[model samples]
Target: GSHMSWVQLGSFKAAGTSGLILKRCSEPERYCLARLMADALRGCVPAFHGVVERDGESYLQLQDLLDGFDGPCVLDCKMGVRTYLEEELTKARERPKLRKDMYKKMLAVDPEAPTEEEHAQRAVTKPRYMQWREGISSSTTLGFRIEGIKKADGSCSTDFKTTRSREQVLRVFEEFVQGDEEVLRRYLNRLQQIRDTLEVSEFFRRHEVIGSSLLFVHDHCHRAGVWLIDFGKTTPLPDGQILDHRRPWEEGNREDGYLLGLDNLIGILASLAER
Candidate 1:
């Protein structure tokens, strides 16, 4: 399978899980970043599987999780997975290039400093998750199962939108209503799942505020629960600011990786064209 492209990190502890994803060329920073967030987001998110240092290369082991309706497929989605990809792609396009001897340039900031700049830079010298995402050759982010219930008419209403789309949501759902009264209900308890994901993002933000960190929400699946991953380049939001603040279309850097999470909630609520 194409996903086999991802090497098994080493070997998983595999007592409760199927296995862990072994991401190669990943940095120790991402390892530690996910590690810490995993602690804060213990239940709402996925777990860190393991880490391995083989041949002097850093490989990350993350819990192999995701099994949606009809038994998981590449099409299954992480909440706001599409937004994440769009955001990253937009940023990449908006700014392109490298700092020659970038390591030395940034490291020159003072490796000796114990907190703030130095430590944070050391951990996220590069966008490790972005690198891994690029390697996965897929249209969307992680695989997540969204078990959609069958309509009385027989067509299943699914919410596997990988990204967000701006349109009159009621109007969008209207078509389905005329087509099928229980179309939205086809989501099963997914509406509740979306609520849970929203809270999960808020929980992480509160921790970031209390901890004074710049972690983002890696978990933003449309149907699945939530996960907080990707610490590389995850910077602390503006200090002493409201954590959750914004309209659905508004974008801000303020603890937003999670804040933008509200976008996922919106997206999940018929996030895109009804499917």
Candidate 2:
């Protein structure tokens, strides 16, 4: 059995004041994006209220979406064709690092997943491991993946790791919203507006948005909104390197598949709204 552990560089917590949450600044890119997005877009992201220091460590103060809500339900959907960055893939290709943990994970899922060479080495490369990860989840085929869902009752589950297909996504959304027609319609409209905003968004045009999530929030009173979150892996593309974001990502291409996932997700919500 493989031992697993996670270390927190920066912790997440609610701020002392109303309408604010504090996030430990783990990466400068996230802080930069937060500032950039604060000015570049509105209502689609948590408002950045500048950075604050708690015991000499920096924390980004952000608008708390759940501040006014009573029993808020949240769904975090990770939008992408591939969650890993091109630089990450390139590094893997160049260094040829291997992970036995990945091999074990693969073996647990499918005994035949490891090739003859992998079996002998008892390891798999980073790209090999990550590619397999995308394959098993909804990220590769459906262009998005569900990270987790928190219901109004405070119960949370991340069991959608293997969930794929339009129908399955729709079912999850239904479960999250409890089949509330108005809430569904509002979410559908908000997605449409987000699509419209992206078309002209200057910030989106220049960034290789990887591993970001769309957080859907709603409460007892049906106050609902969707937001863009997590920019730790997001970075600006090189000069003269433009991306359509809908095209499939190969080795060199910087496509993030954000629009592809959004389009699919919007379609899924629209189907729910129709009924």
Candidate 3:
């Protein structure tokens, strides 16, 4: 069988255009917007290929990839490695505060707002204001899943993972643990900084008890470091304005709590940084 073309993969269809139309052409507009945004981002991150294609009816775009390079890697091969990661970590750290403020503003009309269950039973699912982010589908208001394929060589071509449940995510975190306490300590510190900077400890606790929510990591090459993925479920805090419907607390577990509470372990890992 021949490899699938971008058009054949639903990138060129009237219905696809209609879906985009129904979204007020939000999908196509998003594709264009994302392409431009990704292009701008690539200016800093060398390896990123902000490719976008449209066949009148539908479209295809590049989100991320995990292909490896040949031979020994040079330290300066990529353009925006340090800046991209640093900015990303900073954004991740600020998300919780942004969410909280949004949530608070949303509840001002009804200070004693009811639980989601009560609102659901009363059929009040819609909020007054919605928070929109980049790369989210307008229909679902969630990020699109881009699956990767393995190549003929021993290496894998695509290795992206999307966030779904807390247990599944916790398992990924656990995979990082070895007997080496120092490595574990450094890893935990990064995680703690993410949580503290985001001000998500209480939110983490709520999801931890219920085994529902979790942070996501995309482990493309099975490296020691994992790339963070999927922010659709994140909400603006005070008003509970959601990016999408997949609630994080629905899949949290005990181990998830352990990962959430790994702040104290940071000091232990500092020694390893010198090594």
Candidate 4:
């Protein structure tokens, strides 16, 4: 077994403050989450209560909910398996120049360095990375986060599907895809409002939401708020690229990526009526 270690974390806890933590590494991820808070788009993002800096680190705090759970999440469209890091790496290593560069980086850092001419060679004895973004777990993509409610059970499981009950389904319907057309229209309107306002920002040009996050609330008090949350591997926008109707899915750029997500979210919401 390769290293397998993790501390059970239910929520994020800071100085004199405590709540649910997250599923993965949460620093850059948290930073991106906090950035979305500046405008604080209602109905889309949650109220980021605040963040505290101590010991040379940024700690995030969100408006605490009574019962929040990690909710439903899906990609807006297929990225054609071209975008993710591992795939990128696979393609990149095929280049002779990149292979040589990889060797140099490895030689400089790894104590037991070897000329890795083949992929298998690197796997036998990996390089010891010195930089935060130098190795296998480095941040090379972009993503987002959303706030949520606690699970229905005492286990505090993040899987919203597992925690589902009839009450939760009805609650979900009431919040997102209500049976009543009038009630459902507001959610979509709110989503559209946020999407329109976000398209105007410069931030959209510099950041992309490659991954997604959803915060599912079980009760009315813990309302469902969709947000882009997994920004660990942020891909900056190309110069002169504004976040707009620019054939985003074709380019896999920041603006179009978010737009697809917005559209996909509406699709999911509208489909809920059928359920």
Per-structure clash totals for the candidates? 15, 0, 21, 22
lDDT of 1 at 25: 34
TM-score of structure candidate 3: 0.26
Off by over 4 Å in 4: 1-15, 18-27, 30-34, 40-43, 47-58, 65-151, 154-190, 220-224, 238-240, 243-256
Best by TM-score: 2
Q: Write the per-residue lDDT of candidate 3 for residues 81-116, one digit (tens) a residue.
A: 010112233444555223444345345544445357
Maximum-lDDT candidate: 2
Ordered from best to worst TM-score, the candidate numbers read 2, 4, 1, 3
> Model 3 clash tally?
21
> Model 2: runs farther than 4 Å from truth?
1-10, 38-40, 119-122
Model 2: lDDT of residue 65: 70
Q: Each model's TM-score, in the order given?
A: 0.41, 0.89, 0.26, 0.47
How do the residues 1-275 of candidate 4 rate in per-residue lDDT, one tens digit apiece? Answer: 00011122233442344443323336655666567666444335545555666556565555443214333211111111122433243344554223444555555544354534434444321212211112211111211111233332322322231212333433544443324454355455555666676676555545654444433333223333334444555455567555453343432343324554455455555556445
Q: Which has the better TM-score: candidate 1, or candidate 3?
A: 1
* TM-score: model 4 vs. ground truth: 0.47
**If the candidates were sorted by their lDDT against the true structure, best first, what order would they fall in?**
2, 4, 1, 3
**Residue 206 of model 4, lDDT score:** 58
Give per-residue CA lDDT, model 2, range 21-56, as digits (tens).
Answer: 787786745555565665445668877787888888
Q: Which of candidates 1 and 2 reaches a greater lDDT?
A: 2
